């Protein structure tokens, strides 16, 4: 397939099927597609660029042309008929994984499939192009779903330095509390909206040395006793798991958390069911896209004639 | 306009920029070679050349100067009989026996096709460059490269000042005095416009005044570099105007009046079309 390159470039500003921060900003700053002061060919080309950046970036153009279905399906508000231009892709396995929130990208879902982490009706499918029929149940290994929806596991060095800084700031807080305890308690209540033993209960912590703690993670595990992370380096409660182990949702997840209509998801088991092919209905389309109907109809007119 | 014509012809024929740091007169290519006989005393660029004639017509062009040349001719009978009447012999709203005629002119001399002239020109351009002729220099000190008196010499007690196109090629003020000598003062004191002056002077400074053509050469080059800022400014100028439009028209508070809003749309497309044809 297409070799990923400059997918998230800010100058180009093309939105991609990804949960990435750069993709989030590209979606944020775009506003809307500009089809004005343009000939029909230029409008069609812009619509192709915008829509084809999102729906099937990996698909080769001459392959997408063959996959493209000129005949669409539709089951007071207006039916958005031509948002179904890319509904054919929604039955591909990788797209189903991405829409089920079992991956942070269509490319990541592709790697999950190709690396044998995906099953469809209990048979391991290793081909991203496998098309889902209605009623199929597909599952992903829970470790990979947790990695996809979790923060990056810090290296040992990075988390060790983060712990260094946390000890520094915790010592600072307890120092300032000891100096001026009464108003510290009162002003903490001020945000939350006297017992002098309060500051007495708080206890210092010893600054660690990177040179001496390097390369000894079991030792560093015992040496940390912060109130919030007791006896584990930051983000590495069990260092043998693929994710930030005190499991934390990945950054910038709310913008891209859409619950698809055509899939029924079980996050507890990392399973999903393909209810139906996405279908447009009055005032609503089940093809999750960031572009308006004019862009989709321009892309549809492009692909009907193949750019003529 | 005529001065512009001669200047352009000289530029395209000699192509001064194609031979930088080459002073003096050696025939120039255009088995074909040509040189300037007169009036020009140098094959380098013309110091008086401003590209467009129309800018002689502007308020700022009210002191620009051109390489004209005057002469006097006595009227024959018919002109005397002809230039009489209200129509032709009055202020169109005393008589003379002669007319002062203005004209610009140019001359080229062509080299001889031969095994001699071609190698001669080639070797002259190779081995003996004539160095950087300084302001004040007399070139080769032969009639070919003498400074030409391009303005009427101004003469006062003891001293004659001359405005010259120099074989170095810069506008020059040369002052002769009774001091520097008696004979040189005598000759300069009979010097006139259109003559080649051929001696040394006590001061040979640049002809600073109305060298604004060099100031104009700056302005045009400013435009070319900053012309490309113009479209780029115009982009944000119109973008922010329309981004303001869409905000309050998508929000639809319509602080901007219906008359004025549709004026913006007129500017948006009008600016678009004008950019189209400018490519052509």
């Amino acid at each position: 397939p297409r070799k990923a390159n400059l997918l998230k470039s800010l100058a180009r500003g093309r939105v991609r099927t990804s949960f990435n921060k750069y993709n989030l900003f590209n979606l944020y700053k775009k506003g809307g597609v500009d089809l004005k002061s343009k000939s029909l060919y230029q409008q069609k080309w812009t619509a192709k660029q915008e829509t084809r950046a999102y729906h099937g970036e990996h698909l080769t153009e001459k392959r997408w042309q063959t996959v493209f279905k000129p005949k669409l399906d539709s089951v007071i508000k207006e039916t958005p008929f031509l948002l179904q231009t890319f509904a054919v892709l929604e039955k591909r396995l990788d797209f189903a994984l991405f829409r089920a929130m079992f991956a942070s990208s269509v490319r990541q879902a592709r790697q999950f499939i190709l690396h044998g982490n995906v099953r469809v009706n209990g048979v391991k499918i290793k081909h991203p192009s496998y098309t889902l029929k209605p009623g199929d149940m597909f599952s992903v290994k829970p470790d990979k779903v947790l990695e996809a929806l979790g923060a990056k596991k810090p290296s040992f060095q990075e988390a060790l330095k983060i712990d260094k800084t946390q000890i520094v700031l915790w010592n600072k807080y307890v120092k300032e509390a000891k100096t001026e305890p009464k108003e510290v308690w009162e002003k903490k209540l001020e945000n939350f909206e006297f017992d002098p033993k309060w500051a007495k209960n708080l206890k210092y912590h010893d600054p660690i040395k990177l040179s001496e703690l390097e390369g000894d993670e079991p030792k560093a595990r015992k040496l940390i006793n912060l109130p919030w992370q007791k006896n584990y380096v930051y983000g590495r409660q069990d260092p043998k798991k693929p994710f930030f182990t005190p499991w934390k949702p990945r950054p910038f997840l709310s913008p891209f958390a859409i619950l698809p209509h055509h899939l029924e998801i079980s996050f507890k088991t990392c399973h999903a069911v393909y209810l139906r092919d996405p279908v447009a209905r009055p005032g609503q389309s089940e093809v999750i896209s960031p572009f308006d109907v004019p862009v989709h109809e321009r892309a549809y007119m492009y692909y009907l004639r193949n750019g003529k | 306009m005529g001065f512009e014509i001669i200047a352009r012809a000289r530029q395209i024929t000699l192509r001064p920029e194609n031979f930088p740091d080459e002073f003096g007169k050696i025939p120039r290519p255009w088995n074909y070679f040509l040189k300037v006989i007169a009036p020009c005393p140098h094959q380098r660029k013309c110091p008086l050349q401003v590209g467009n004639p129309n800018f002689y017509t502007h308020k700022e062009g009210k002191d620009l100067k051109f390489c004209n040349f005057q002469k006097s001719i006595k009227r024959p009978k018919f002109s005397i009989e002809l230039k009489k009447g209200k129509l032709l012999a009055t202020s169109w709203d005393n008589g003379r026996d002669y007319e002062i005629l203005n004209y610009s002119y140019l001359i080229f001399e062509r080299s001889h096709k031969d095994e001699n002239t071609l190698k001669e020109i080639k070797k002259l351009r190779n081995e003996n460059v004539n160095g950087k002729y300084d302001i004040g220099s007399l070139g080769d000190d032969t009639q070919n490269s003498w400074p030409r008196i391009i303005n009427d010499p101004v003469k006062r007690k003891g001293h004659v000042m001359m405005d010259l196109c120099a074989p170095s090629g810069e506008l020059e003020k040369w002052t002769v005095s009774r001091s520097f000598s008696k004979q040189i003062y005598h000759d300069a004191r009979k010097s006139k416009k259109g003559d080649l002056w051929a001696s040394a002077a006590k001061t040979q400074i640049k002809g600073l005044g109305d060298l604004n053509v060099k100031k104009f050469h700056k302005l045009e080059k400013e435009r070319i570099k900053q012309l490309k800022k113009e479209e780029r400014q115009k982009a944000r100028k119109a973008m922010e105007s329309y981004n303001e439009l869409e905000d309050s028209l998508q929000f639809d508070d319509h602080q901007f009046s219906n008359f004025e809003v549709m004026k913006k749309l007129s500017t948006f497309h009008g600016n678009d079309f004008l950019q189209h044809v400018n490519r052509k």
Partner: protein
């Protein structure tokens, strides 16, 4: 109403000369279409000597003035086929199924987009001038189109009778 709802799109923008004795005088012609996308459309023309902006300005006002209601079937297409001759352009336009695109000439595309004609398939024969295409397009849209209700009333029939029977 006018600014917020109506959309303006330039259709023609050109320089036309009127060579006078002294020299070539060049003016700017602009032809625009204004439509609310909800069953009202109009065309406008403007001619300005000094800058095209004024041409488009007067064209926008003229289009606003000639804004007219346009018959529409299901608010998405023409009621039936329209075969229309206008000053040398032959427009053959066909209503289409829901979801069908605007598979027409570009000028007709902007006109339909402005006027809310979602569905159409057409061909332009004989001359293909954009000017004449647009004028004939609007004329054939409004003169050459009759509503099923109007046809039935003129024939004194109920809509159930006039409506076509389904065959397969």
């Amino acid at each position: 109403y006018i600014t917020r709802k109506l959309t303006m799109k330039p259709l023609v923008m050109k320089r036309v000369s009127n060579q006078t004795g002294k020299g070539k005088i060049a003016s700017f012609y602009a032809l625009v279409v204004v439509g609310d996308k909800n069953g009202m459309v109009g065309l406008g023309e403007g001619k300005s000597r000094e800058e095209m902006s004024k041409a488009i300005f007067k064209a926008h006002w003229d289009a606003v003035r000639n804004l007219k209601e346009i018959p529409r079937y299901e608010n998405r297409t023409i009621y039936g086929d329209i075969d229309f001759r206008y000053h040398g352009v032959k427009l053959h336009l066909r209503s289409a199924k829901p979801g069908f695109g605007l598979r027409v000439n570009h000028v007709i595309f902007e006109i339909c987009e402005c006027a809310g004609i979602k569905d159409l398939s057409g061909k332009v024969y004989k001359s293909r001038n954009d000017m004449n295409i647009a004028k004939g397009t609007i004329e054939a849209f409004t003169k050459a189109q009759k509503t099923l209700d109007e046809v039935a009333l003129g024939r004194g029939k109920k809509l159930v009778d006039v409506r076509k029977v389904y065959y397969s």
